[PDB]
Amino acid sequence: RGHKIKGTVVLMRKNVLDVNSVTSVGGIIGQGLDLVGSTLDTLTAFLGRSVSLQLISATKADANGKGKLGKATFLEGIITSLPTLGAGQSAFKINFEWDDGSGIPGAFYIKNFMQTEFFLVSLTLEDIPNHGSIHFVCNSWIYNAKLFKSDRIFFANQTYLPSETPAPLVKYREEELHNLRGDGTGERKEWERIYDYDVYNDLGDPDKGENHARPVLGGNDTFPYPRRGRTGRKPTRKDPNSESRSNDVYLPRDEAFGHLKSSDFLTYGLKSVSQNVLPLLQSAFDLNFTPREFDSFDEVHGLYSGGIKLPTDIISKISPLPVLKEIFRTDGEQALKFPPPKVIQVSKSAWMTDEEFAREMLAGVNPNLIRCLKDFPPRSKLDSQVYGDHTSQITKEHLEPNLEGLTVDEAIQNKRLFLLDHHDPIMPYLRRINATSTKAYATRTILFLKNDGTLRPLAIELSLPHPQGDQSGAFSQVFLPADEGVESSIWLLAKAYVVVNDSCYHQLVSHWLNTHAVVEPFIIATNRHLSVVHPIYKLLHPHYRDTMNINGLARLSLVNDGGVIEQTFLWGRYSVEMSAVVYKDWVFTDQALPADLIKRGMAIEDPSCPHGIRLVIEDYPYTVDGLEIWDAIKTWVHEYVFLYYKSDDTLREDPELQACWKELVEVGHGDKKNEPWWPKMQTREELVEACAIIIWTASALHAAVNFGQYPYGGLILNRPTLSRRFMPEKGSAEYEELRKNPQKAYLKTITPKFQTLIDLSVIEILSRHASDEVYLGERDNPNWTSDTRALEAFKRFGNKLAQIENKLSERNNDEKLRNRCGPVQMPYTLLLPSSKEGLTFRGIPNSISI
Ligand SMILES: [Fe+2]
């Protein structure tokens, strides 16, 4: 019998997801009469000769082997309500002529004949033979059909390895993969979905002047770098090897996510801080309605209570900015306020303590760098310059004080000495950096694990390049802890010089290089080579949400020439170059949490222990909490991979996975293509490991290093971003100023008031979860596969994360674990998987989304 297949299309109109139309001011969303489509009839526009869908048979082919096409059919009618219809979603009825000749639909083509694009959410088919409903999850913007050569195609729910693809769909699956790759030529346009690679030749503006030029990162041995998404803009006129600047940076269309709520448009907020808030605030300082300099610590604390008095000239141009109404507290006229950072909510002065300084290396914004000291004195990895065939100038006489009464040899034996080494990355650039307004040191800090389980800083080494040349080693000075008099003020400054090194390393390497930059080539390789239908595509896809968008924004506004990072952080104009130098030492398999802990000497392998490793510092909150989430991720990945691959041979035989990984190594991270540590993709265990590392990187690692930025460093005093003065010398006038007024001396050493305001405004956005964040584990978008085994496995994953959330909260109430809270009384909640919106100090998103 000839029968009609009943379809329901769910879509979302442009107006409901677009920044320009959704900006009134934003407060409630997910709500409304869950904007049921029908009401307010722009919906009738979709109902004529506007939108056509054409079914493609999965089980029946034409003469040349491609699935049989049905008749192009138009949207018939509006569905007013459905039990699962969401906020902003509109539903349409469409009935397809099909018969028992053309078999089971497995894909469809769609054509939009309207002027305006819409976001296609889903197709659902209610069918004909002994067959359940067929679901299609689309989540894609559909532009006008005249813009494309072949029609937009979408496949059903069914997950298929290349060998498992229904014969009539084989050519459709390969053709879309081809269309996603492009041909490597052309300027990319907004409506396109073309994924390809380019180097970082994107950040400078050499047409504006030679001092605005920035070196090309990647594709050479001096500055290797991961690739980023190809945009295809015309080169600069002055330099052929650099790409010209634009106010719009292309990314493949479905990588840019819209939002139902105005305040969830965070990249928009960030861009507005660069383009609108930064030049306008800079005008208050280039005048005098704001004094240029903080004069006291009380003046810093006033940012959070009464705020900073600005004229209403600037205030009335900054307060009605679309997304920024949430993050900028405004009393009325004479104040820009900032929310109190968690670090000072219980105690204003606890950050100054040695124990908080030390604790923040284990549970702070950059909890990833500390190493156990294996030999003494600490050595440098630098080349022919002679302090690197020499050592640190910290001596054994320096480390014998008050606490445990051990010798240095004993304390190394018993694994009680630890190092935070910031000597090598900055050293080669120090002479250049100190020729600007910045004055910095290369630092080392040695820490002792006390009997009470907490860490204590024992000595700080400050090093400068050269009395008489670089071949002459390091000029080093050593500073010891002190709690009274001028010597305590010196020690606080020594601590600030370390933290200034740490903040810059954190921003550029721990955060930017190790999450953002390193992940982007994996997104490109995945889309280029794995069909949407591939199991591993589905495993990885939630972990890529909005990453290319925030990275494109970073290229424009954050990491560009004269952008926020160069103006705010210690390394200045060398910031991104130096991160390429650090990338020379990046190894993919050491990003796995257990490998990292082992590599830094913070754990030893031990099968007697809960995660197979024994920690050397038991109360190391980042690492003990991280290991629960790492193990949950790796278990999920293993269960999932082993649903699909029957043997290692079926993995070796998979052409999509093999081409993905070959292009990842040879092109995406192509400056490291000959490194021997890359997984070969010859074994299911190597696939598990690679996939776990990408998901850990995108989710927990980025969250751990990102979401504590405002809570710890919203007080500039605790995490200063640059230094401007060398240490006061014993008989100068600066030492007397330190004696008479140490707060003023502290303040004129660290980040000035202007750059403090920029820093705070940026890290307040960076530390916020949007309302519509999708978190690790439980959360996905929809009906993403019809494989009930995968659904069950994913549910087990969600359940384990909820169990881990309870265990983690319980550790926060344990009084024996002092590193979890500190004198600052800030329970470590950074690795708690779930969160509400805002500046919470918690929540692990699936992806790098901000
Ligand atoms: Fe980020």
PDB file of N, CA, C and O in Angstrom, residues 536-583:
ATOM      1  N   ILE A 536      32.983   7.389  16.955  1.00  0.00           N
ATOM      2  CA  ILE A 536      34.015   8.149  17.660  1.00  0.00           C
ATOM      3  C   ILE A 536      33.783   9.638  17.472  1.00  0.00           C
ATOM      4  O   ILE A 536      34.062  10.417  18.396  1.00  0.00           O
ATOM      5  N   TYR A 537      33.163   9.991  16.338  1.00  0.00           N
ATOM      6  CA  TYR A 537      32.655  11.358  16.135  1.00  0.00           C
ATOM      7  C   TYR A 537      31.654  11.714  17.226  1.00  0.00           C
ATOM      8  O   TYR A 537      31.752  12.797  17.786  1.00  0.00           O
ATOM      9  N   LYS A 538      30.726  10.813  17.528  1.00  0.00           N
ATOM     10  CA  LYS A 538      29.725  11.062  18.565  1.00  0.00           C
ATOM     11  C   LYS A 538      30.301  11.114  19.959  1.00  0.00           C
ATOM     12  O   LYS A 538      29.739  11.790  20.807  1.00  0.00           O
ATOM     13  N   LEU A 539      31.386  10.388  20.190  1.00  0.00           N
ATOM     14  CA  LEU A 539      32.026  10.330  21.498  1.00  0.00           C
ATOM     15  C   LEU A 539      32.700  11.678  21.780  1.00  0.00           C
ATOM     16  O   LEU A 539      32.592  12.224  22.891  1.00  0.00           O
ATOM     17  N   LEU A 540      33.297  12.244  20.726  1.00  0.00           N
ATOM     18  CA  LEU A 540      34.132  13.408  20.853  1.00  0.00           C
ATOM     19  C   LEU A 540      33.344  14.731  20.687  1.00  0.00           C
ATOM     20  O   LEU A 540      33.712  15.741  21.302  1.00  0.00           O
ATOM     21  N   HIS A 541      32.305  14.728  19.846  1.00  0.00           N
ATOM     22  CA  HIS A 541      31.591  15.967  19.468  1.00  0.00           C
ATOM     23  C   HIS A 541      31.146  16.929  20.601  1.00  0.00           C
ATOM     24  O   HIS A 541      31.469  18.091  20.462  1.00  0.00           O
ATOM     25  N   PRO A 542      30.528  16.470  21.711  1.00  0.00           N
ATOM     26  CA  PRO A 542      30.157  17.411  22.796  1.00  0.00           C
ATOM     27  C   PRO A 542      31.358  18.123  23.384  1.00  0.00           C
ATOM     28  O   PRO A 542      31.209  19.223  23.844  1.00  0.00           O
ATOM     29  N   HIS A 543      32.535  17.534  23.259  1.00  0.00           N
ATOM     30  CA  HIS A 543      33.730  18.109  23.832  1.00  0.00           C
ATOM     31  C   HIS A 543      34.413  19.219  23.058  1.00  0.00           C
ATOM     32  O   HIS A 543      35.417  19.787  23.508  1.00  0.00           O
ATOM     33  N   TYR A 544      33.807  19.574  21.922  1.00  0.00           N
ATOM     34  CA  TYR A 544      34.330  20.561  21.060  1.00  0.00           C
ATOM     35  C   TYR A 544      33.431  21.819  21.033  1.00  0.00           C
ATOM     36  O   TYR A 544      33.721  22.750  20.308  1.00  0.00           O
ATOM     37  N   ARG A 545      32.334  21.817  21.782  1.00  0.00           N
ATOM     38  CA  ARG A 545      31.337  22.874  21.661  1.00  0.00           C
ATOM     39  C   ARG A 545      31.895  24.290  21.921  1.00  0.00           C
ATOM     40  O   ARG A 545      32.395  24.570  23.033  1.00  0.00           O
ATOM     41  N   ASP A 546      31.765  25.141  20.902  1.00  0.00           N
ATOM     42  CA  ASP A 546      32.146  26.565  20.929  1.00  0.00           C
ATOM     43  C   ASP A 546      33.669  26.812  20.990  1.00  0.00           C
ATOM     44  O   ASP A 546      34.091  27.937  21.097  1.00  0.00           O
ATOM     45  N   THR A 547      34.495  25.776  20.864  1.00  0.00           N
ATOM     46  CA  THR A 547      35.950  25.977  21.041  1.00  0.00           C
ATOM     47  C   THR A 547      36.569  26.831  19.942  1.00  0.00           C
ATOM     48  O   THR A 547      37.261  27.842  20.225  1.00  0.00           O
ATOM     49  N   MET A 548      36.243  26.501  18.694  1.00  0.00           N
ATOM     50  CA  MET A 548      36.706  27.292  17.554  1.00  0.00           C
ATOM     51  C   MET A 548      36.242  28.764  17.601  1.00  0.00           C
ATOM     52  O   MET A 548      36.999  29.639  17.207  1.00  0.00           O
ATOM     53  N   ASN A 549      35.051  29.007  18.173  1.00  0.00           N
ATOM     54  CA  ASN A 549      34.506  30.343  18.414  1.00  0.00           C
ATOM     55  C   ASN A 549      35.320  31.121  19.432  1.00  0.00           C
ATOM     56  O   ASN A 549      35.778  32.184  19.127  1.00  0.00           O
ATOM     57  N   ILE A 550      35.536  30.580  20.628  1.00  0.00           N
ATOM     58  CA  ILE A 550      36.370  31.299  21.607  1.00  0.00           C
ATOM     59  C   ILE A 550      37.833  31.448  21.114  1.00  0.00           C
ATOM     60  O   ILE A 550      38.435  32.501  21.306  1.00  0.00           O
ATOM     61  N   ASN A 551      38.339  30.488  20.333  1.00  0.00           N
ATOM     62  CA  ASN A 551      39.700  30.633  19.815  1.00  0.00           C
ATOM     63  C   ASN A 551      39.798  31.684  18.740  1.00  0.00           C
ATOM     64  O   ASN A 551      40.792  32.407  18.683  1.00  0.00           O
ATOM     65  N   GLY A 552      38.724  31.843  17.950  1.00  0.00           N
ATOM     66  CA  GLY A 552      38.744  32.830  16.881  1.00  0.00           C
ATOM     67  C   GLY A 552      38.723  34.216  17.516  1.00  0.00           C
ATOM     68  O   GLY A 552      39.428  35.134  17.089  1.00  0.00           O
ATOM     69  N   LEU A 553      37.942  34.337  18.591  1.00  0.00           N
ATOM     70  CA  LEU A 553      37.871  35.577  19.363  1.00  0.00           C
ATOM     71  C   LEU A 553      39.212  35.904  20.056  1.00  0.00           C
ATOM     72  O   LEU A 553      39.652  37.070  20.108  1.00  0.00           O
ATOM     73  N   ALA A 554      39.884  34.862  20.553  1.00  0.00           N
ATOM     74  CA  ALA A 554      41.204  35.057  21.136  1.00  0.00           C
ATOM     75  C   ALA A 554      42.227  35.599  20.117  1.00  0.00           C
ATOM     76  O   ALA A 554      42.967  36.515  20.433  1.00  0.00           O
ATOM     77  N   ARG A 555      42.206  35.092  18.886  1.00  0.00           N
ATOM     78  CA  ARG A 555      43.080  35.591  17.790  1.00  0.00           C
ATOM     79  C   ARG A 555      42.840  37.063  17.439  1.00  0.00           C
ATOM     80  O   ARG A 555      43.758  37.820  17.101  1.00  0.00           O
ATOM     81  N   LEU A 556      41.590  37.473  17.572  1.00  0.00           N
ATOM     82  CA  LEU A 556      41.203  38.842  17.295  1.00  0.00           C
ATOM     83  C   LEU A 556      41.492  39.773  18.469  1.00  0.00           C
ATOM     84  O   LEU A 556      41.914  40.887  18.285  1.00  0.00           O
ATOM     85  N   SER A 557      41.206  39.343  19.688  1.00  0.00           N
ATOM     86  CA  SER A 557      41.140  40.319  20.777  1.00  0.00           C
ATOM     87  C   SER A 557      42.035  39.986  21.959  1.00  0.00           C
ATOM     88  O   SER A 557      42.404  40.862  22.728  1.00  0.00           O
ATOM     89  N   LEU A 558      42.452  38.738  22.078  1.00  0.00           N
ATOM     90  CA  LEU A 558      43.164  38.387  23.289  1.00  0.00           C
ATOM     91  C   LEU A 558      44.668  38.269  23.131  1.00  0.00           C
ATOM     92  O   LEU A 558      45.419  38.811  23.919  1.00  0.00           O
ATOM     93  N   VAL A 559      45.098  37.635  22.056  1.00  0.00           N
ATOM     94  CA  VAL A 559      46.466  37.154  21.900  1.00  0.00           C
ATOM     95  C   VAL A 559      47.150  37.842  20.663  1.00  0.00           C
ATOM     96  O   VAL A 559      48.270  37.544  20.261  1.00  0.00           O
ATOM     97  N   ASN A 560      46.420  38.788  20.084  1.00  0.00           N
ATOM     98  CA  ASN A 560      46.847  39.648  18.981  1.00  0.00           C
ATOM     99  C   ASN A 560      47.798  40.759  19.434  1.00  0.00           C
ATOM    100  O   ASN A 560      48.003  40.977  20.623  1.00  0.00           O
ATOM    101  N   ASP A 561      48.396  41.408  18.452  1.00  0.00           N
ATOM    102  CA  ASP A 561      49.361  42.460  18.695  1.00  0.00           C
ATOM    103  C   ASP A 561      48.698  43.636  19.425  1.00  0.00           C
ATOM    104  O   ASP A 561      47.672  44.160  18.999  1.00  0.00           O
ATOM    105  N   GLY A 562      49.236  43.960  20.591  1.00  0.00           N
ATOM    106  CA  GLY A 562      48.668  45.006  21.428  1.00  0.00           C
ATOM    107  C   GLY A 562      47.329  44.646  22.059  1.00  0.00           C
ATOM    108  O   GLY A 562      46.641  45.529  22.548  1.00  0.00           O
ATOM    109  N   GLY A 563      46.968  43.357  22.068  1.00  0.00           N
ATOM    110  CA  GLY A 563      45.689  42.915  22.613  1.00  0.00           C
ATOM    111  C   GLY A 563      45.734  42.801  24.133  1.00  0.00           C
ATOM    112  O   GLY A 563      46.748  43.183  24.729  1.00  0.00           O
ATOM    113  N   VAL A 564      44.698  42.228  24.765  1.00  0.00           N
ATOM    114  CA  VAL A 564      44.673  42.216  26.253  1.00  0.00           C
ATOM    115  C   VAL A 564      45.838  41.498  26.948  1.00  0.00           C
ATOM    116  O   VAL A 564      46.407  42.063  27.851  1.00  0.00           O
ATOM    117  N   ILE A 565      46.283  40.363  26.410  1.00  0.00           N
ATOM    118  CA  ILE A 565      47.363  39.597  27.021  1.00  0.00           C
ATOM    119  C   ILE A 565      48.736  40.301  26.964  1.00  0.00           C
ATOM    120  O   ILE A 565      49.421  40.396  27.992  1.00  0.00           O
ATOM    121  N   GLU A 566      49.084  40.883  25.821  1.00  0.00           N
ATOM    122  CA  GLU A 566      50.329  41.641  25.714  1.00  0.00           C
ATOM    123  C   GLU A 566      50.365  42.866  26.642  1.00  0.00           C
ATOM    124  O   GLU A 566      51.430  43.197  27.173  1.00  0.00           O
ATOM    125  N   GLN A 567      49.209  43.511  26.870  1.00  0.00           N
ATOM    126  CA  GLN A 567      49.174  44.720  27.697  1.00  0.00           C
ATOM    127  C   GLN A 567      49.143  44.384  29.180  1.00  0.00           C
ATOM    128  O   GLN A 567      49.469  45.210  29.999  1.00  0.00           O
ATOM    129  N   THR A 568      48.717  43.181  29.526  1.00  0.00           N
ATOM    130  CA  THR A 568      48.378  42.895  30.907  1.00  0.00           C
ATOM    131  C   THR A 568      49.419  41.976  31.578  1.00  0.00           C
ATOM    132  O   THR A 568      49.655  42.086  32.783  1.00  0.00           O
ATOM    133  N   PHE A 569      50.063  41.102  30.810  1.00  0.00           N
ATOM    134  CA  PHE A 569      50.894  40.076  31.453  1.00  0.00           C
ATOM    135  C   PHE A 569      52.396  40.286  31.260  1.00  0.00           C
ATOM    136  O   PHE A 569      52.813  40.983  30.362  1.00  0.00           O
ATOM    137  N   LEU A 570      53.178  39.653  32.122  1.00  0.00           N
ATOM    138  CA  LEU A 570      54.629  39.877  32.216  1.00  0.00           C
ATOM    139  C   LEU A 570      55.418  39.798  30.878  1.00  0.00           C
ATOM    140  O   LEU A 570      56.193  40.698  30.546  1.00  0.00           O
ATOM    141  N   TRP A 571      55.131  38.792  30.058  1.00  0.00           N
ATOM    142  CA  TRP A 571      55.941  38.544  28.828  1.00  0.00           C
ATOM    143  C   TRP A 571      55.679  39.526  27.708  1.00  0.00           C
ATOM    144  O   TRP A 571      56.486  39.650  26.778  1.00  0.00           O
ATOM    145  N   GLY A 572      54.582  40.267  27.805  1.00  0.00           N
ATOM    146  CA  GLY A 572      54.443  41.460  26.976  1.00  0.00           C
ATOM    147  C   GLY A 572      54.321  41.091  25.519  1.00  0.00           C
ATOM    148  O   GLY A 572      53.585  40.140  25.198  1.00  0.00           O
ATOM    149  N   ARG A 573      55.136  41.722  24.678  1.00  0.00           N
ATOM    150  CA  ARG A 573      55.096  41.481  23.238  1.00  0.00           C
ATOM    151  C   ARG A 573      55.643  40.119  22.806  1.00  0.00           C
ATOM    152  O   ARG A 573      55.428  39.707  21.679  1.00  0.00           O
ATOM    153  N   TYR A 574      56.279  39.404  23.725  1.00  0.00           N
ATOM    154  CA  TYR A 574      56.873  38.121  23.435  1.00  0.00           C
ATOM    155  C   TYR A 574      55.980  37.001  23.886  1.00  0.00           C
ATOM    156  O   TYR A 574      56.388  35.842  23.828  1.00  0.00           O
ATOM    157  N   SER A 575      54.786  37.335  24.370  1.00  0.00           N
ATOM    158  CA  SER A 575      53.945  36.371  25.070  1.00  0.00           C
ATOM    159  C   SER A 575      53.637  35.117  24.271  1.00  0.00           C
ATOM    160  O   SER A 575      53.875  34.013  24.756  1.00  0.00           O
ATOM    161  N   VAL A 576      53.156  35.296  23.050  1.00  0.00           N
ATOM    162  CA  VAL A 576      52.725  34.126  22.251  1.00  0.00           C
ATOM    163  C   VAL A 576      53.902  33.337  21.673  1.00  0.00           C
ATOM    164  O   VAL A 576      53.853  32.110  21.641  1.00  0.00           O
ATOM    165  N   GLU A 577      54.946  34.031  21.245  1.00  0.00           N
ATOM    166  CA  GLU A 577      56.230  33.386  20.871  1.00  0.00           C
ATOM    167  C   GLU A 577      56.762  32.471  21.927  1.00  0.00           C
ATOM    168  O   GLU A 577      57.201  31.385  21.653  1.00  0.00           O
ATOM    169  N   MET A 578      56.802  32.966  23.148  1.00  0.00           N
ATOM    170  CA  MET A 578      57.363  32.179  24.244  1.00  0.00           C
ATOM    171  C   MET A 578      56.547  30.947  24.493  1.00  0.00           C
ATOM    172  O   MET A 578      57.119  29.904  24.793  1.00  0.00           O
ATOM    173  N   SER A 579      55.223  31.020  24.288  1.00  0.00           N
ATOM    174  CA  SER A 579      54.400  29.820  24.407  1.00  0.00           C
ATOM    175  C   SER A 579      54.701  28.802  23.295  1.00  0.00           C
ATOM    176  O   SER A 579      54.453  27.621  23.481  1.00  0.00           O
ATOM    177  N   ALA A 580      55.203  29.262  22.147  1.00  0.00           N
ATOM    178  CA  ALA A 580      55.608  28.367  21.090  1.00  0.00           C
ATOM    179  C   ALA A 580      56.911  27.694  21.489  1.00  0.00           C
ATOM    180  O   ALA A 580      57.109  26.520  21.126  1.00  0.00           O
ATOM    181  N   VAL A 581      57.811  28.445  22.149  1.00  0.00           N
ATOM    182  CA  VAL A 581      59.014  27.828  22.696  1.00  0.00           C
ATOM    183  C   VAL A 581      58.696  26.733  23.728  1.00  0.00           C
ATOM    184  O   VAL A 581      59.360  25.692  23.723  1.00  0.00           O
ATOM    185  N   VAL A 582      57.673  26.945  24.573  1.00  0.00           N
ATOM    186  CA  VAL A 582      57.256  25.955  25.554  1.00  0.00           C
ATOM    187  C   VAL A 582      56.639  24.736  24.877  1.00  0.00           C
ATOM    188  O   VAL A 582      56.862  23.592  25.315  1.00  0.00           O
ATOM    189  N   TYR A 583      55.913  24.974  23.786  1.00  0.00           N
ATOM    190  CA  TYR A 583      55.317  23.912  22.980  1.00  0.00           C
ATOM    191  C   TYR A 583      56.342  22.904  22.440  1.00  0.00           C
ATOM    192  O   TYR A 583      55.988  21.737  22.246  1.00  0.00           O
TER     193      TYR A 583
END
